[PDB]
């Protein structure tokens, strides 16, 4: 292929595995299945793909976890593949390594953390119910657009104090950063997201509100006032986390539930298992994969890594690794030890994971109680999409209104 970058002199020929992050060959089998090919019998723990400019890929949880823990060798400064995206990526605190990362992470944690989630609980609850009830009698829906997107996004926009009418533009921009269609480079999408924020940040620094943006813009980092530039780099990240994470996960989960009546019946019969089901689904349908850049030449697991080399450390793969979970592709709500790195690992552990679990658990509970029985629209060929964050293109669902019930 002409999409293969010349193999660098230091990368062993036998370690080449041309996996394409943005268009994995086995995509038709499902995105997680497509990435799992990296864990087949004769694939080593660490491989090099010539796709997307050329980069390393850790295929097992042991290495993924080790690398995320060693920020001195594996820096978050250039976290995205391709290298151009990684270089343009300057969100805070994600593009920083400890120790400088911490003072900013603390502030971000204050705007989307548990205390904030507890506060949003009732509104999250109300929106879920409102959306599901309006869909209930129709006996059908395009899940991605009718629920997966509006539910998590409106909650984030509510938190950020931003008008919902701005969602089409913002969502388009965020998606170009994770699963670009080619219309925009990462740099262009980032510049447009920042352009959107600049005047809003200025406005709220002059007249502070109680929304997440105001809190960030008027916040302090270890005692000193955050700058306009810093607030922009943090708010941009929050927007991406709010618009392109839970939105995708919900569709993976609901697609699975629509194709598995037995699992639905398990949660219907024993709803107290929903939280556990949530964690198991987060493992099986993990969907994130970013990485790091080598700060210096370093021998890792018998492989010579060179300064500047990029290494993809798929958060998605840890929990799908059979060395972490037996029968990894099987969904077992009773799974004894659900091992995964779905929300990351190390100093950059996901800050929105608490908001995320709340949204997921609320969805499972409120949907199954009103629409306990549903399936994929007949003949529908569900398509997944791969990138920094993977997703589902469309999920047409159907059900008999007669089997539903208002709650
Ligand atoms: C199912 C949903 C979600 C998944 C799977 C997810 C996953 C992750 C992962 C893998 C990381 C670490 C990446 C790295 O180490 O470079 C991370 C970081 C982060 N996430 Fe989430 N996330 C989710 C939802 C959210 C939401 C709803 C927000 C809220 C805006 C959010 C905010 C953040 C922030 C601010 C960080 C940066 C932490 C840091 O760099 O110190 N996430 N997330
Ligand atoms: C890898 C992520 C899921 C995490 C939150 C949004 C995201 C795309 C980032 O840039 C950090
Ligand atoms: K070589
Ligand atoms: K960078």
From Swiss-Prot:
GO cellular component: cytoplasm
InterPro entries for this protein: Cyt_P450 (IPR001128), Cyt_P450_B (IPR002397), Cyt_P450_CS (IPR017972), Cyt_P450_sf (IPR036396)
A GO term for molecular function: iron ion binding
Top EC group: oxidoreductase
A Pfam family of this chain: p450
Chief subcellular location: cytoplasm
Record keywords: Cytoplasm, Heme, Iron, Metal-binding, Monooxygenase, Oxidoreductase
Named cofactor requirement(s): heme
Pathway terms, separated by semicolons: Terpene metabolism; (R)-camphor degradation
UniProt cross-references to SUPFAM superfamilies, sorted A to Z: Cytochrome P450
EC number of this enzyme: 1.14.15.1
Function description: Involved in a camphor oxidation system.
Family classification: Belongs to the cytochrome P450 family.
Protein's name in the database: Camphor 5-monooxygenase
Organism name: Pseudomonas putida (Arthrobacter siderocapsulatus)
């Amino acid at each position: 292929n002409a999409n293969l970058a010349p193999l660098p002199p230091h990368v062993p020929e036998h370690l080449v595995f041309d996996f394409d992050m943005y268009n994995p060959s086995n995509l038709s089998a499902g995105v997680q299945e497509a990435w799992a090919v990296l864990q087949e019998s004769n694939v080593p723990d660490l491989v090099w793909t010539r796709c997307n400019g050329g980069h390393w890929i850790a295929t097992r949880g042991q290495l993924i976890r080790e690398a995320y823990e060693d920020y001195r060798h594996f820096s978050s400064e250039c976290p995205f593949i391709p290298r151009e995206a990684g270089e343009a990526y300057d969100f805070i605190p994600t593009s920083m390594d400890p120790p400088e990362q911490r003072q900013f992470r603390a502030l971000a944690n204050q705007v989307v953390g548990m205390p904030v989630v507890d506060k949003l609980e009732n509104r999250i609850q109300e929106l879920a119910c409102s959306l599901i009830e309006s869909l209930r009698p129709q006996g059908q829906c395009n899940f991605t657009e009718d629920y997966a997107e509006p539910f998590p996004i409106r909650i984030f926009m509510l938190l950020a104090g931003l008008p919902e009418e701005d969602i089409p533009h913002l969502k388009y921009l965020t998606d170009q950063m994770t699963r670009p269609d080619g219309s925009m480079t990462f740099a262009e999408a980032k510049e447009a997201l920042y352009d959107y924020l600049i005047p809003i940040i200025e406005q709220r620094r002059q007249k502070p509100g109680t929304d997440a943006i105001s809190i960030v813009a008027n916040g302090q980092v270890n005692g000193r006032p955050i700058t306009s530039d810093e607030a922009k780099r943090m708010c941009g990240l929050l927007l991406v986390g709010g618009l392109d994470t839970v939105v995708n996960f919900l569709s993976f989960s609901m697609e699975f539930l629509a194709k598995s009546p037995e699992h639905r019946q398990e949660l219907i019969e024993r709803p107290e298992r929903i939280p556990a089901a949530c964690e198991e689904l987060l493992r099986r349908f993990s969907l994130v994969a970013d990485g790091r850049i080598l700060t210096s030449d370093y021998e890792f697991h018998g492989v010579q890594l060179k300064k500047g080399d990029q290494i993809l450390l798929p958060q998605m793969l840890s929990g799908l690794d059979e060395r972490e979970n037996a029968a990894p592709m099987h969904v077992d709500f009773s799974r004894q030890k659900v091992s995964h790195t779905t929300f990351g690992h190390g100093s950059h552990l996901c800050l929105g994971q608490h908001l995320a679990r709340r949204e997921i658990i609320v969805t499972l509970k409120e949907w199954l109680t009103r629409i306990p029985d549903f399936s994929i629209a007949p003949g529908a060929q569900i398509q997944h999409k791969s990138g920094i964050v993977s997703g589902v293109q469309a999920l047409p669902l159907v059900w008999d209104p007669a089997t539903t019930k208002a709650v």
